Amino acid sequence: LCGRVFKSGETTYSCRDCAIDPTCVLCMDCFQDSVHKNHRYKMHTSTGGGFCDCGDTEAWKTGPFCVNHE
Ligand SMILES: [Zn+2]
Ligand SMILES: [Zn+2]
Ligand SMILES: [Zn+2]
Description:
Layout: E1 11-15, E2 26-27, H1 28-32, E3 41-45
Antiparallel strand pairs: 1-2, 1-3
One zinc ion is lined by residues 2, 4, 26-27, 29-30, 52, 54.
Binding site for Zn(2+) 3: 15, 18, 30, 36, 39, 54, 66, 69
Zinc finger (UBR-type): 1-70
Binding site for a peptide: 51, 53, 56
């Protein structure tokens, strides 16, 4: 599990194809090493205090782990 806490302004990513809902999100480092960079991804600018869902098998229809966290 990544679980990194986002700072305000940080760039993060959801996947329209795989996210169970629009709040499922990856930090940039996880996103870049994930299957979702080749999907219908959607960038989000953090308000601050959200967290990365990399490794959460409940959050992603495919590829819940990036290469770093597999
Ligand atoms: Zn992460
Ligand atoms: Zn990861
Ligand atoms: Zn995806």
